[PDB]
Amino acid sequence: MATGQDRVVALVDMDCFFVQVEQRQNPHLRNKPCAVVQYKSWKGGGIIAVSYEARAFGVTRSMWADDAKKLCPDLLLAQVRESRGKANLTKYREASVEVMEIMSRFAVIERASIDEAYVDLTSAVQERLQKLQGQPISADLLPSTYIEGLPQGPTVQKEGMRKQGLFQWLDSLQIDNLTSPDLQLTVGAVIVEEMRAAIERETGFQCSAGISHNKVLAKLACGLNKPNRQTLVSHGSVPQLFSQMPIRKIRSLGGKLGASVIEILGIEYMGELTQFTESQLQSHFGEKNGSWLYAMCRGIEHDPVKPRQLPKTIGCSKNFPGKTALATREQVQWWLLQLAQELEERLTKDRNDNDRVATQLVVSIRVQGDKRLSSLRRCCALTRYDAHKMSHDAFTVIKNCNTSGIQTEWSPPLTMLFLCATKFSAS
DNA sequence: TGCTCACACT
DNA sequence: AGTGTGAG
Ligand SMILES: O=c1[nH]c(=O)n([C@H]2C[C@H](O)[C@@H](COP(=O)(O)OP(=O)(O)OP(=O)(O)O)O2)cc1F
Numbered sequence: 001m002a003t004g005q006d007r008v009v010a011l012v013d014m015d016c017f018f019v020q021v022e023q024r025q026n027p028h029l030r031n032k033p034c035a036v037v038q039y040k041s042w043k044g045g046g047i048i049a050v051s052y053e054a055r056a057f058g059v060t061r062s063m064w065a066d067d068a069k070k071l072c073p074d075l076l077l078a079q080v081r082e083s084r085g086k087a088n089l090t091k092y093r094e095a096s097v098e099v100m101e102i103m104s105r106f107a108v109i110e111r112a113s114i115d116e117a118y119v120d121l122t123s124a125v126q127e128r129l130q131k132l133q134g135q136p137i138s139a140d141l142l143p144s145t146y147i148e149g150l151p152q153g154p155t156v157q158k159e160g161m162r163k164q165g166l167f168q169w170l171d172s173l174q175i176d177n178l179t180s181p182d183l184q185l186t187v188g189a190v191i192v193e194e195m196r197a198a199i200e201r202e203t204g205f206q207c208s209a210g211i212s213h214n215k216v217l218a219k220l221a222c223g224l225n226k227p228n229r230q231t232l233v234s235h236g237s238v239p240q241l242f243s244q245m246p247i248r249k250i251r252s253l254g255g256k257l258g259a260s261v262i263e264i265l266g267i268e269y270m271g272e273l274t275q276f277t278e279s280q281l282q283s284h285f286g287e288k289n290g291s292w293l294y295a296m297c298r299g300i301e302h303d304p305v306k307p308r309q310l311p312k313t314i315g316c317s318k319n320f321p322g323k324t325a326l327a328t329r330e331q332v333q334w335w336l337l338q339l340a341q342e343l344e345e346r347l348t349k350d351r352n353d354n355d356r357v358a359t360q361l362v363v364s365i366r367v368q369g370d371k372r373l374s375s376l377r378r379c380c381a382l383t384r385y386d387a388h389k390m391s392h393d394a395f396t397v398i399k400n401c402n403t404s405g406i407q408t409e410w411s412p413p414l415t416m417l418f419l420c421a422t423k424f425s426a427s
Numbered sequence: 428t429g430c431t432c433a434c435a436c437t
Numbered sequence: 438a439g440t441g442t443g444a445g
């Protein structure tokens with residue numbers, strides 16, 4: 001009976017990352033309710049990142065800025081840079097690289113998004129445990145750490161509660177056994193306090209972390225005590241944790257599959273999966289999903305932290321909603337050329353920085369009237385980092401989609417253009 | 428929201 | 438390949 005305690009895994013997550021990047025650059029905005037927007041001319045801008053001050057008012061991602069100002073009249077905004085008619089994330093990718101390089105000094109990380117990485121600390125934990133003689137862990141080593149499900153048993157202030165929970169954990173900690181999985185988690189989190197202490201010292205950014213035994217738990221745990229805090233979710237907190245945890249809060253159960261787990265099975269919380277056999281779960285959801293759900297609701301997951309701090313694709317997309325859909329052939333050239341131009345800037349940087357070339361160009365369009373994120377994906381070869389050739393070749397492989405009999409028109413009008421560089425080879 | 432990115436299925 | 442899902 002194996003219990004998924006073999007690894008120590010952490011998930012770190014930059015608290016409102018884009019906001020922090022803007023607040024480091026423009027100090028005026030620090031410690032105020034503020035958000036980052038892109039494209040101001042439509043309803044003040046779509047909001048893509050919201051500080052915690054601003055969230056206390058209810059400002060959320062994907063509002064329009066004009067609606068966020070209704071909820072938060074003193075809300076400060078920063079706008080994303082625009083390059084060649086489109087939002088340009090280069091400042092945030094560069095802060096992201098800053099943080100990931102720091103994290104890498106500690107343990108191998110899997111970049112998961114521009115603002116989070118997973119951390120396999122199985123190996124760093126063993127080494128620390130031998131430098132540590134066997135001496136107890138001081139509560140002073142975990143000054144921003146919450147123990148989930150503690151305190152329990154026979155203080156009205158938040159910091160008060162945390163200390164009581166950490167004292168209880170440490171008081172019962174079995175430091176003489178260099179193999180108790182709870183002790184490894186504790187050491188895992190000491191390493192995460194230091195790793196987080198150095199992000200802040202060396203970039204000024206604050207972040208939250210989750211320390212558990214796999215990636216799903218660490219990600220849940222990270223969310224439990226935001227902002228600027230870390231949470232140990234031990235194997236033993238799982239039954240109480242999952243007992244009232246909605247299915248949709250576990251990673252990858254937030255969409256259609258989770259909804260079917262809810263409907264088909266007639267349950268609400270992750271804990272309720274444990275009453276079904278593995279073959280039962282497989283019969284509703286397939287061999288892989290039933291297996292995955294059977295182990296997960298018992299706190300067991302095996303997805304490895306992959307040693308991958310660089311993306312597999314470089315992508316450049318722009319939407320054209322509404323009357324702004326592209327209706328003329330020479331409109332479609334121009335944006336393609338705009339898209340191929342930013343793609344080229346970024347490809348050359350990536351060759352120079354990271355020693356690889358992309359070999360396949362993926363083009364994708366949206367048609368006025370279709371339903372889905374994409375309406376069509378097509379590819380060709382990517383042999384030169386040249387905007388004019390990349391955009392020419394991208395046109396070539398989409399020109400037949402033009403249903404219009406006219407040459408100078410384009411029917412149906414295009415609602416999105418997308419270029420993606422993939423298939424990387426060492427350079 | 429829009430602009431990304433990883434991945435499973437076929 | 439090309440499509441669909443899930444996420445930040
Ligand atoms: O829908 C989105 N839009 C959207 O621009 N981004 C962008 C902007 C954001 O700063 C950055 C971070 O992604 P996160 O979803 O993890 O959120 P954070 O801002 O870092 O902090 P917290 O999770 O609120 O504590 O991606 C994510 C989306 F998911």
Ligand SMILES: [Ca+2]
Pocket residue numbers: 013014015115116
């Ligand atoms: Ca986050």
